[PDB]
Ligand binder design. Structure first.
Ligand SMILES: [Mg+2]
Ligand SMILES: [Mg+2]
Ligand SMILES: [Mg+2]
Ligand SMILES: [Mg+2]
Lengths: 369, 369
């Protein structure tokens, strides 16, 4: 199960009929990522963190697979709502909610909410009386209550008429270590037992996301999941457990196709200007501190090269001292691992359009494969 | 001529009928900025760098004042086109242009282009034969040709059938010093004289933008402009001169109104969660490295406080150790100097909506003033 990657040959045919920049998403790779987690982490229901990639066809696919969704705003709920997904398939997992989100949640039957602060309680009580709440704990600044505050928060939520349902945590570092998940599970187990004595019965546990990215998927990743799963089955036999994969689901299912629109050859280091930049899909360099494999298809010897985005900004520099062949205006390059926290942070700065996401499975290139 | 600033009283009335976050733009302040530059820098025609703020009503206002526009993409041309602005009022001042931009330029009668590289010539020659070109010089990495390459570039453009029209430079640091503008003017004067001997007659000079921001406007800023203007009248009596103000035009004409939607009071330092963040108008913290005056309207004693945005991201932190009164959910705060490179870099990340820009002059609060 390889990471999705267009061939030089497919790049060229796509770009003849689709103007660059564009992204190409493989629904089959998304499905493979989903089934892999199902196979090796069966105990955890999936709350897909759609903030990572909200492409409508990806969301429809996941929903038909049985996925639930972690939503952060009215906007995300609205996107899902248009695809026929109900609030019963959502959790409003933004710890601090606004009026619009709360109204959308009530409109679309979202009953599950997360919170970490006493200030969030009355607002949820008024907006969705009797709703199910999970307290977010910090097992380690912006989010999560102190472990030893968790059950008083759930109790206060119960006092205000909400249903104290469970606990969630986030411990994913994108490391292969299971230690941090397993550790969190032991803390959660203790709080679940203490809660029973306080007149609460907790039923759901959410272990968050931030899984390691799949190999350009592999056995070590499968083994980590099996190990998490074994601890879940041991510790929480009768509890509904959930995970919130985001990057994991789509990061490796999408690529970016971008054209060289300018060169500068006067420096020792040649510069190539691409038609997508740091204000577009590469915004993930700014916000996500991420790096994306760049593939140039040139034959010849290569020299350290700079790639810049199309903006009038000086900051729109993508790669420096990158070994690359001599490229010319009109050449297409290919950037992989472009599925997560890239397109979602794109802007209309300078009036540039949002690069569209094209579905591979709907293209002649797919049948040929 | 003060910087635009809503009163506590206007904030409250606005927010009762407009849900936060929203921006409020003062057309009168924009006009005042424009007329100020006209008054003190009469020689320079204005190419408004709309990338800084493309609010339709601001653009309509400027166009009716006689402003021209510096456009960077098809998208920007399209925005202007919908407001009845013609390409005769535009310069396509992105040194590396794409197919869509070039097609929009031909559709909307844009005849003026800037360039800095030999690779850009043939593309412009094919797209807009005979168009007027200005070479961008570096007087100081992404943009600008070496000074001593400038006239060979203009000559090569002439060879390909384009019209060698002039030169532009960018030297604005947002310092009060005129030295850098004046210096550039002497370089330009030398190239204009050399060009005459090479069979070119240059007619237009563009001195770029990056003016100092107007005082929370002032006499020192007026004096700088008068001094630039005096050197323009001396050096370039018969040349059409232009400037590309961006930040200067609107930065001080717009404010952001945002609500406290959550608090965290358990730390020594209280945290306030606002309904606009780093993925929205405060994206200028990321891309523009800028700082925005924050005004809280509270009565009481104040303590170092953190303000965070509404996102599920950890990075959405706006102000730390900021002296602030005790604020509560539902309180509105006010951020000034929010007119430039803020809204333009906002995203739909997490599904959040783009904060809309409301025109002050269309509000009951304006008449009351
Ligand atoms: Mg993940
Ligand atoms: Mg159990
Ligand atoms: Mg300026
Ligand atoms: Mg002259």
């Amino acid at each position: 199960m390889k990471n999705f990657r267009l061939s030089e040959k497919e790049v060229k045919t796509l770009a003849k009929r689709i103007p660059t920049p564009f992204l190409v998403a493989s629904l089959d790779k998304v499905e493979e990522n989903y089934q892999f987690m199902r196979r090796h982490l069966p105990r955890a229901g999936v709350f897909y963190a759609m903030k990572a990639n909200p492409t409508p066809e990806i969301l429809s696919l996941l929903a038909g697979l049985g996925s639930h969704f972690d939503v952060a705003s009215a906007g995300e709920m609205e996107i899902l709502h248009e695809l026929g997904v109900d609030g019963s398939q959502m959790i409003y997992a933004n710890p601090v909610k606004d009026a619009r989100g709360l109204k959308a949640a009530a409109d679309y039957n979202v009953r599950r909410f997360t919170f970490d602060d006493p200030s969030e309680i009355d607002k949820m009580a008024k907006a969705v009386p009797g709703a199910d709440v999970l307290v977010r704990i910090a097992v380690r600044t912006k989010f999560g209550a102190p472990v030893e505050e968790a059950l008083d928060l759930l109790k206060a939520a119960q006092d205000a008429g909400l249903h104290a349902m469970g606990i969630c945590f986030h411990v994913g570092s994108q490391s292969l270590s299971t230690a941090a998940y397993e550790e969190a599970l032991l803390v959660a187990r203790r709080l679940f037992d203490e809660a029973e004595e306080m007149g609460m019965h907790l039923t759901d546990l959410d272990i968050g996301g931030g899984f390691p990215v799949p190999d350009a998927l592999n056995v070590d990743l499968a083994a980590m999941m099996e190990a998490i799963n074994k601890q879940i089955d041991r510790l929480f036999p009768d509890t509904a457990v959930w995970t919130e994969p985001g990057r994991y689901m789509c990061g490796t299912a999408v690529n970016l196709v971008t054209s060289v629109i300018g060169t500068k050859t006067r420096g020792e280091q040649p510069w190539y200007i691409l038609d997508e930049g740091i204000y577009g899909c590469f915004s993930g360099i700014m916000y996500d501190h991420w790096t994306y494999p760049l593939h140039c298809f040139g034959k010849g010897n290569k020299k350290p090269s700079t790639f810049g985005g199309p903006s009038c900004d000086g900051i729109d520099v993508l790669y420096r001292d990158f070994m690359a062949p001599e490229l010319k205006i009109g050449d297409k390059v290919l950037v992989t691992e472009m599925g997560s926290y890239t397109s979602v942070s794109a802007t209309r700065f300078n009036g540039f359009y949002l690069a569209p996401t094209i579905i591979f499975e709907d293209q002649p290139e797919y049948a040929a494969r």
